[PDB]
């Protein structure tokens, strides 16, 4: 009935906004301090803010229906009509997208195949390319359920059609900022990550995408707020909070030393305190430990 956290080394957890495991762990007083993410968000109560899915596989994947036309004009493009990945149709609501939809400005490179239904079917694959950023060349608007994915300099004259399933594989010109969810209008989003006491730095679990460029590759690092195990643990247990905060302790397990004192707040993040300038990492073999609720304004312990 008291809260508990999974005894799992953070180096052994899936990620939230991109399906690949965790590598680093670091605080940062330089980067934008007020992110407004919409994946990997959860109340320690056990509800799901934003568009957070439940599985891991459901991340940055959308199902849809595929249909073409040739008037544009911008190349041989396709028009998808979003539906929820389980199979049930999609009817607009409060969340600004179906479950599990990418939320970072850039230009993906998806891989799309035929939604399987039973053994012995026939499958076909392609490789589209979809823009998400603040570029209103095409009317990009998932809220209504309409996206415009192009076709790459592909092969296979016979394209795909019907019920499909898209899974991301790349990035290009990445930029950590929300896409245009509606065509310029507003949508009910998750609020920012605030507020913070003086001398406050979030804690960020960091992963590594693969950022394509001209005939080469390069890794680029995208963060989140919590690994996916916390999401799929809270969202199931549904504890009952007591006040406002919850103090933790990053505790190595080889010896039993201490590494910092981080406050698991109530709206789904793990604040710290750190007064330096550059970015500083930690090891990734620790194990968290719940200690005790406290008030919000509880003074911190300056790490260095």
């Amino acid at each position, epitope marked *: 009935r008291m809260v508990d956290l999974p005894v799992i080394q953070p180096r052994l957890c899936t990620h939230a906004r991109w399906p690949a495991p965790v590598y680093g762990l670091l605080v940062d007083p330089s980067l934008p301090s007020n992110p407004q993410w919409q994946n990997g968000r959860v109340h320690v109560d056990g509800t799901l803010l934003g568009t957070t899915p439940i599985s891991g596989s459901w991340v940055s994947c959308f199902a849809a229906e595929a249909a073409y036309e040739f008037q544009s004009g911008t190349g041989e493009v396709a028009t998808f009509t979003l539906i929820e990945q389980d199979g049930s149709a999609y009817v607009p609501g409060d969340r600004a997208a179906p479950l599990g939809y990418p939320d970072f400005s850039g230009q993906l490179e998806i891989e799309v195949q035929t939604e399987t239904t039973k053994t012995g079917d026939k499958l076909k694959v392609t490789t589209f390319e979809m823009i998400l950023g603040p570029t209103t060349n095409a009317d990009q608007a998932p809220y209504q359920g309409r996206v415009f994915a192009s076709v790459t300099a592909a*092969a296979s*004259l016979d394209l795909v059609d019907g019920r499909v399933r898209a899974v991301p594989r790349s990035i290009y010109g990445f930029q950590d900022t929300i896409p245009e969810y509606n065509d310029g209008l507003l949508v009910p989003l998750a609020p920012p990550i605030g507020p913070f006491l003086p001398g406050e730095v979030l804690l960020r679990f960091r992963t590594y995408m693969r950022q394509i460029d001209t005939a080469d590759a390069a890794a680029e690092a995208i963060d989140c707020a919590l690994p996916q195990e916390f999401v799929s643990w809270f969202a199931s247990n549904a504890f009952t909070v007591q006040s406002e905060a919850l103090l933790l302790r990053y505790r190595n397990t080889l010896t039993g030393q201490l590494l910092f004192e981080c406050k698991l707040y109530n709206e789904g993040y793990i604040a710290l305190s750190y007064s330096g300038s550059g970015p500083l990492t930690f090891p990734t073999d620790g194990i968290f430990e719940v200690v005790s609720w406290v008030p919000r304004l509880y003074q911190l312990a300056s790490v260095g």
Partner: antibody
Amino acid sequence: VKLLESGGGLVQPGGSLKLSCAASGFDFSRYWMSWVRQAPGKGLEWIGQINPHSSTINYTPSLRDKFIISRDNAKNTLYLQMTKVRSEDTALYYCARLLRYFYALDYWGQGASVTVSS
Amino acid sequence: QIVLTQSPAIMSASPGEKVTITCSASSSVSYMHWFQQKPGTSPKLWIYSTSNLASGVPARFSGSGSGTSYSLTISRMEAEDAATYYCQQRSSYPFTFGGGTKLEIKR
């Protein structure tokens, strides 16, 4: 969205020729292409098709060994190559900008007139 | 290796009438296309997937049929509907065009 050809003229039996279909006004390095011929009189006839990567190239079963299709993305042109040309293979030659899902050869050039002669 | 047959080879009519053109099949197919070549001009796409209209055609025309027999019909003819019409099938094999038929004015 405008094409053109060159290389039409006169050749002798057994000879060889290089038709050059040039294009302008669109992303020529993204669309498939094809060639079709019309003998004076009789109806149309398919030659084959070539994708952008030159990966796969489909020829009609007959008369494969006499035609070599290729392209160049840099200079933005397309080449057809005839070898050991015979006398029966005189016609008009067109280069179409084939389309992706519905095959639908949509935009055609102007016409290359090829005639064998002595 | 499918061969097609267009019938009739040549046929005419007068404006205001409805004409039909059949392009049969030697084997089961699934789609056909139609082209229009006025003399001294490169052909042009007219009707694809047996039922749709190209970019810039008057809505008089009509494509239908299924199975192994397709046909193209106009509602009312005109003076700008005189040219050879070809049927192509993008079904399964080395593609093939039909023999092609003509359609001209009756005076």
